[PDB]
Amino acid sequence: MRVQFPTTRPRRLRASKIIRDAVAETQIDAGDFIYPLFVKPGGEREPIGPMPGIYRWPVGRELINHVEEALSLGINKFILFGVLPDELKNPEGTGGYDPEGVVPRAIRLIKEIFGDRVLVFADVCLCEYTDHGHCGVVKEKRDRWYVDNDETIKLYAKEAVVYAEAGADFVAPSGMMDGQVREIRRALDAHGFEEVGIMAYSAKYASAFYGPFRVAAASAPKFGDRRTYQMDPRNAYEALKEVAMDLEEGADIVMVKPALAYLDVIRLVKQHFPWVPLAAYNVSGEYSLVKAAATAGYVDERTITLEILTAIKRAGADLILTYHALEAAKWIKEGL
Amino acid sequence: MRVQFPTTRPRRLRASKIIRDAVAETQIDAGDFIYPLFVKPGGEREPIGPMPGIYRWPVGRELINHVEEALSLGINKFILFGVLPDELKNPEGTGGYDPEGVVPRAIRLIKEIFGDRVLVFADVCLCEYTDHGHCGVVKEKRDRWYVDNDETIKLYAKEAVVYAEAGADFVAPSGMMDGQVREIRRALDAHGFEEVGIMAYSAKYASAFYGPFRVAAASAPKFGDRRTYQMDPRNAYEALKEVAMDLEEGADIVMVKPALAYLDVIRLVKQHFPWVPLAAYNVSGEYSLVKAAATAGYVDERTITLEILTAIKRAGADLILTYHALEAAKWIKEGL
Amino acid sequence: MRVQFPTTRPRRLRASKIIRDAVAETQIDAGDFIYPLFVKPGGEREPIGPMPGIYRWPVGRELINHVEEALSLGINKFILFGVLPDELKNPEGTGGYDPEGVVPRAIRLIKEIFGDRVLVFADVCLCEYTDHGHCGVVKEKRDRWYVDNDETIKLYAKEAVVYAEAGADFVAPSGMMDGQVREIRRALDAHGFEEVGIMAYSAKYASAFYGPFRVAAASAPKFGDRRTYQMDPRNAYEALKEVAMDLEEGADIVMVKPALAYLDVIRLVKQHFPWVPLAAYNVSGEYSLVKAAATAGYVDERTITLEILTAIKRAGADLILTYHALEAAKWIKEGL
Amino acid sequence: MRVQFPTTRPRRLRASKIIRDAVAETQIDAGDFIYPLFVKPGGEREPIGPMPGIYRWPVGRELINHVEEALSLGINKFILFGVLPDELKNPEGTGGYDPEGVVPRAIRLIKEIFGDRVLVFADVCLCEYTDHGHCGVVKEKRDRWYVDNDETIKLYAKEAVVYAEAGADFVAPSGMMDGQVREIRRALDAHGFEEVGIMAYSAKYASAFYGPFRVAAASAPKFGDRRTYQMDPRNAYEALKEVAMDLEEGADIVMVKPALAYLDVIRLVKQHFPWVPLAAYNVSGEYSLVKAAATAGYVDERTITLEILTAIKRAGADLILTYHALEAAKWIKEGL
Amino acid sequence: MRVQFPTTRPRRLRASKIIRDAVAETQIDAGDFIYPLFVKPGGEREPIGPMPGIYRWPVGRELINHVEEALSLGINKFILFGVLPDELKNPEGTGGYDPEGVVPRAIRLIKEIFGDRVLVFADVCLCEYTDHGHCGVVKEKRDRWYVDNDETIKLYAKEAVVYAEAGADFVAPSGMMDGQVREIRRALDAHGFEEVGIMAYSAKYASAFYGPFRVAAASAPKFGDRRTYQMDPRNAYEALKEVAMDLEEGADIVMVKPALAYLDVIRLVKQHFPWVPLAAYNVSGEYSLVKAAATAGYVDERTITLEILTAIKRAGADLILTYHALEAAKWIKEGL
Amino acid sequence: MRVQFPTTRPRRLRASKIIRDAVAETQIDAGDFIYPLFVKPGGEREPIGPMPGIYRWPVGRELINHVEEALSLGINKFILFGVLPDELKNPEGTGGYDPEGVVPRAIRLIKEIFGDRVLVFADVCLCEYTDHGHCGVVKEKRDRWYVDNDETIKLYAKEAVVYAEAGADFVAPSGMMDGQVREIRRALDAHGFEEVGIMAYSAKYASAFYGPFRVAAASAPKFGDRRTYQMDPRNAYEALKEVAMDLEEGADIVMVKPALAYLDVIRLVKQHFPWVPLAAYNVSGEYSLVKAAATAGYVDERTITLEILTAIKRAGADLILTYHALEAAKWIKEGL
Ligand SMILES: [Zn+2]
Ligand SMILES: [Zn+2]
Ligand SMILES: [Zn+2]
Ligand SMILES: [Zn+2]
Ligand SMILES: [Zn+2]
Ligand SMILES: [Zn+2]
Ligand SMILES: [Zn+2]
Ligand SMILES: [Zn+2]
Ligand SMILES: [Zn+2]
Ligand SMILES: [Zn+2]
Ligand SMILES: [Zn+2]
Ligand SMILES: [Zn+2]
């Protein structure tokens, strides 16, 4: 850029909202969001401690309130999460594959009464359904403990096929187990579900930003370490290897969890794989950080959230996984 | 990445701590920090609410109280923002360019007494020193108002040369006025300050994350927004234009502000000007956001500020300005 | 690609209306449109037969009425075109820089009444304001006629500086005359208008698609050929020099006329100048093709108008000029 | 660049048709073209005034009529389409794989009467030959309706092998069914037609421009909406992955349908696959659009048809499928 | 680099140890070192002639009374080279696969007492273990003397399996035999050690900087050279292939050997494989070179060894194999 | 890089000396060497202990016989370095720019009894001729000592005009003062030496590899670091700014000193400025290191010093400055 002052004034293009908006590089809208719904196996509906305004819906008319409202705001794609009582959690997380489950009743339900007016994403992991709360089967092999890869993946394979049968449009493995997309695809495709798609949590990072979702889903270990499956957050370039394998194995969409502390990684993923669609999870504690600081007084809650989503899109995410979606979607007239 | 499962299992590199540390793309230390000091004539220490624990020191023994504390931790670079009473602000900003004003008094104090034991960056702006809260001279053309450019640039020059005359090692224009780097670098070269550097706040954005600052600086704009000179969070590639021109003008170091919600932009700049040092400002807000969540339950203050500051490095920043600085430095045992 | 069938099924993402929208690369709105107004000295709104729908509005209530229309549909960006009768046309151009002629009044009216809720681009040429209709001063040098650059350049500087006074946010030169942008920028900078912005028709081509413009503005070359000055349509890369020079000269926005038939150029410019706002002109004729073919049986109007505007976006343009502007902006019902 | 007015004047190279023709980046000719022949079983020369210009040829004595003319102008490539009545179409589409069908008899003939003096492409789709009108076999997977991917490929195999036998030099799938190239290949290879090559419509877009070729072959659809196979026109980068698969899978030439509206794609595909050849079908509508504006006076049919064909060439296209071909061919005086 | 003098004065970033360290591109700490231990069956510490200051340790109680001292300074990663009395040395090399060898003892020992507080790599080659001292197994075709690639490769497999059996975290094939990685990778997986990892001497040059190590290990060749396996020094680009092939093969870490004299290759590989963690070997007599010259008078031992270690980093290396590391690490204040 | 073992066996190309030689990316001849001569005033061939092998030749038979012998080995180009004692040194460094000095006599002589048969680079720097050993002029302004950039740089232009007049083909500035090549080519051009070229020591690192030369020449600085003018070895990319400025300023040849421990900077520099011819200085320490390692036979002095030199080629350097020039030019028969 051998443009030069004062012949060229960058500020001409910031003289007025009507112009900044014309020449703006990024744009958001409600379609870019996926809303996550927490689903518990009948009962009351429960407020969620870390996550203001977010709830754990039992699988009923709690739809009426929420999936239909969200639709009437523009949000029309959803990702579902099992949240159990400890009383049905076993060290090989049977929860995940139980057609009379939690989530597969939620899927069945929503997809019955809404049909193709919605798209349902379905989380594929054991950490919401295991005794110990890691994302897989453990092996007390005679040295030390570790979440064993090759048996834990076949559990994800079953997990998927339940939801595929129950009618979910997408399946989306968050395990960070290697070969996960491989052994799912080959499940699905063997059970005649070529129609079903896979959105891989491919570059999922070992983050403190999960604090709230651990509380809000039950998932939370008893030997407290993700670090031997979730990516080391010092590593950006590592993420390319992970997106590339998760693509040869045949995922359809790819993502980066969390987003806000990883925007640099989104743009490095997006610009080596332009042809891929790219999602990104405005995660658990990126929410409650805003909210903490919004009410405790510090930051205009409206602006700072749209600033934080415009950021995620600007980096290069095509789809964003916010718990905000709804309260962001009536945001229809932004400051930027 | 013509690479398969199960021949290469990415988790081999995740599996120890000794190894993840062995292979980690990024690392960080207290050399990388720049701690900001708030500074005032007042005579009485004065706490910033929406911080906190960051105070508005008067020019006295924040010396061999506080700068000397910061130093003992490996933190030897400081940026000064002067603050003051509405009593002594006018529309043309004088308190800035004023040999006897706050910042100069402080610069001279800190230099004469540490000396070359530390660096002293000096913010150059008029937001802390004006009547209207804005960063330049204001005018009216007809329908509307504006911050006239080339009349304020000249004021930045005076400030720059006032703080240089006092001892300043670098001058750092925060205004986003066009041309300023060059009107500073020249006015400086003229007064015999070839030896004084310029750290340009090159790509600084119209952010909602500044809230806490304006209270810390008595600098909130008393009418309207800054969206008329600070960049449009919508825009990444715009910052390659802004950084290029600042380099051509004589900027020794170039920065991205705010840092956390613009990591994509850090990396974009850095992957383009590999040969320039790149600063990043972990702002007023991404401290206040954190201390908020921290206080009110949601997150581990320690592990999430070191995820956040590490994220800033990984994207590309060589230096970080942060109000954590001191606390982050005793985090001298790497939890990742 | 390390990507094979059946493992990867590219149709998965084409499966529903809902996911196709999800992963789509491109999009549109009235925010992206620059609607032209054809403005005339006095009388009636004359219909313009080769371009059904768009009349020639007489500068006054009936116009400024029709601009509220545009504004209620989201459109807030107008490029002003002066048309006037034979009797006021002459060899060296007059009307164009007659301070209370056609377009100055139009600029003013629209600014005074709406002002900072609406952006005004003002075209800078001598086609609509000359005897011959050629876009510059015509000279004779012992061979044949030729359109003189450096004396027509000068006349633009006069035209731009007039519209500048009248209140125009932007000036936009369509003459393809060399160094035009710099003369306009130096004039404007000299007569006080550093605030005022230039949008070069940098890469305007010698197309057949302008015919119905020369019926709307009576710009018809009374003899000969634009080809002496407008770009040779065999040349894609030639337009990288045309952009690059206009950018050094001091342009702010850059465009490519026509648009539909030069989509590959739009990509080529945009991928060499990611940091520059690009625009593009869905012209005089590309509308007149969609109309004549639709009007007479051959293709659906609202799908082909939309599909064509979705192109220009996809090809690269942040802004599209179109005489489809409004009808496409009520196409909020995105049919793909 | 480093290239400046007035020292460099672009217009020196615009100032005569003798240097514009010298420095021109692009050329065209009959050699570049590929002429479609709509063929039908028994009847008169049925006119396609839904276009118009083009006719529907009765397989037999009116090759002289056409092919032998075209060839006299240097048009020596032909892609064959088939038209049948409703009495002769069924849900599996047997028009295709019937050696005394329409399209296989037209091959025998022209290959018999001309030999290697004229190359012959054959269209491999069911849309001309099914009673629904869809490009594939329709199904009803327990719930909604769809076009079965794997099953409809295996018909395209039979079609291709039938047309190989019957005499085609090349074959061309346009169903956009994933794997079409792979299976048409193995079929052809293992009936010893490794000689015979595949011109994949590998980036066919779901376009409003086909309206005419619907009324030219009776291939419009009953439960109608092609968006589940034919591409999402928001998508350019999609097309790299869609081409790059058809190359692995053994395609020979790669193409983009439509052309005019997707020139931006062409440049993208060609700059990523410089080594593969690349055609682009100038559509039924892009031809018709021009004609109906020619009807009602808005453009010079001759200029705007050479301007369009010279643009597809400009973009990257090696070959061009055009209904103009025969007009375009006898324009031997390049009017630009 | 459009930057010009005197307005840009590159010396401003060299004026102060503060600011010179601020903008420093590169950094070092013990966490980058892998220290090599020479292990012998018994007796005492033989000092090593050429490498003044390293000993051959007996697999005794100077494990800890070196390895414990290594730990303290901050060096926790070791690579284990065996050193045999050449009674136990044959043409097939049978210290390599002997479970009660030296290397297997010292693995079994160090991990017994240090556990996963220390990482342990084993060297895998047969120059320490054959009577002829070649890295593989010799043969004679119609040729003469030649190291057999495909037989010898199987012994590295047998060697590695043992070292994992004995308990090594990692394994490292230095023979430069082709395809050596998936032959070692398929043993390890096929004997359940999915968890063990491979640091691959990918680009290991045929160098004279090994003079000292040949003496420390008894690994000198009795005949011929290493040139028919180890890389030819003239070639940088050959090392991309050699790396790229070892990463398809299942490798984890990838080194260039030796280092100082092949830094241009270290940058060349790191810039083609940014996602892959790259090691490098500050090799036998890159250390004896320094150690000689320091006694000799000529050069400063401290700064020259840190300049050389900083170098191998500044290039790329994420890990350095060095015989300095211990004395290196207690340099805790920067030369540069 | 989709070669796969065992189909592709890298070792085929290492088979024999001939095939290695056949494919080798790099070569040497003595054409690439530039031999330095330390030249002293008072007649007495004085040996150099921290070399050794090199002398302080006095200007006469002894010297001119040395170069006579050089040329015979093909060493046909030299760089002259003036050594002289503590009487002829002084703060401003006069010694350097006296035309009856050593270095201007040494030139004129070689030029007399050789002329066009030989090329003579002249080093331009005050560190050989000052009281204090610094490469420029010290100023003790305030209470910090600092080498003054704009005052030393005029005295470089003197020294330069002087050697140009003695008959030097090239002039080469090694002081790393900024704007030096500019100052030197304005002076040469003014006194009418437009054909006298400049080889800048563009990117000269502050090394510990220089201690032997400090002894040879007496450049040993009496007080302090060279750190404030020499490049920090931590930085590679900083080199490109340094070269690109030296090119714009008028350089012809560009160098990177030292070489061995900066091969990586050579590749980085040479890949960005491929059209610039690049030299590299094999230094004082990279000679004396080797010599000592050889003298206490740790490593083979013939193969190491061609291995070292072949590396400086492989990296990018078209010319190498060595003291091995001759002993390495005779070594006709390759390593390697
Ligand atoms: Zn989980
Ligand atoms: Zn994975
Ligand atoms: Zn400010
Ligand atoms: Zn700026
Ligand atoms: Zn015009
Ligand atoms: Zn132009
Ligand atoms: Zn079809
Ligand atoms: Zn396909
Ligand atoms: Zn070996
Ligand atoms: Zn290998
Ligand atoms: Zn010197
Ligand atoms: Zn320099």
Side-chain angles (χ1 to χ4, degrees), chain D residues 61-241:
Chain D
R61 305 139 175 90
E62 292 159 84
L63 70 90
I64 297 156
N65 185 229
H66 249 275
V67 169
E68 207 175 299
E69 166 172 4
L71 224 150
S72 80
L73 300 72
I75 301 154
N76 87 100
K77 295 99 200 204
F78 298 93
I79 201 161
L80 290 159
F81 294 91
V83 201
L84 325 175
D86 293 319
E87 64 190 293
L88 218 155
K89 311 177 195 195
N90 48 279
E92 303 271 13
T94 327
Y97 31 99
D98 171 352
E100 356 290 321
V102 197
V103 69
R105 287 188 310 108
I107 313 211
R108 280 162 222 288
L109 202 183
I110 311 163
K111 286 305 304 182
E112 183 159 343
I113 207 172
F114 291 89
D116 72 271
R117 300 198 70 251
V118 73
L119 189 77
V120 181
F121 297 79
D123 191 67
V124 179
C125 204
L126 303 179
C127 55
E128 290 87 352
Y129 306 150
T130 55
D131 52 348
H132 24 72
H134 285 249
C135 290
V137 165
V138 180
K139 281 278 189 58
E140 183 95 35
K141 189 157 174 271
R142 335 312 309 189
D143 295 276
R144 216 56 251 117
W145 72 261
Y146 75 126
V147 179
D148 190 74
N149 193 74
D150 292 15
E151 181 150 332
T152 188
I153 287 157
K154 284 168 277 165
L155 298 174
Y156 297 162
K158 303 185 60 143
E159 296 198 64
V161 176
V162 163
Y163 311 154
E165 275 273 32
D169 301 291
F170 266 80
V171 299
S174 66
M176 283 299 326
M177 314 298 325
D178 307 326
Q180 60 195 38
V181 195
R182 187 225 206 173
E183 289 226 60
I184 289 169
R185 187 73 271 166
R186 271 109 132 265
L188 267 59
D189 277 342
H191 287 59
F193 291 119
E194 302 104 311
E195 327 112 56
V196 169
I198 310 151
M199 185 184 57
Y201 291 50
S202 57
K204 192 162 173 168
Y205 281 106
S207 209
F209 286 79
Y210 303 128
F213 173 82
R214 279 147 160 69
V215 214
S219 52
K222 200 280 258 282
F223 346 77
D225 176 56
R226 293 201 192 284
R227 333 217 99 275
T228 25
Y229 34 109
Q230 299 190 176
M231 280 181 70
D232 187 10
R234 273 86 58 90
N235 305 346
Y237 280 95
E238 186 160 79
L240 300 177
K241 191 198 82 193

Side-chain angles (χ1 to χ4, degrees), chain A residues 1 10-11 21 25-26 50 147 177 207-208 228 233-238 248 261-262 264 267 271 307 314, chain B residues 1 5 11 21 25-26 177-178 207-208 233-238 248 261-262 264 267 271 298 307 314:
Chain A
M1 11 292 139
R11 277 187 70 216
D21 279 23
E25 280 182 35
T26 301
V147 175
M177 313 305 324
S207 173
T228 54
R234 286 167 301 192
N235 311 354
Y237 285 94
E238 179 167 50
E248 339 208 341
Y262 297 89
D264 66 300
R267 155 165 272 133
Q271 84 201 174
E307 174 155 332
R314 183 189 66 248
Chain B
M1 42 238 179
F5 185 82
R11 289 176 81 214
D21 281 355
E25 280 170 27
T26 284
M177 290 352 300
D178 287 344
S207 184
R234 265 91 71 74
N235 296 330
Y237 281 96
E238 193 173 55
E248 291 177 28
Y262 300 87
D264 67 318
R267 151 164 278 118
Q271 74 185 175
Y298 312 131
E307 200 179 319
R314 182 189 67 248

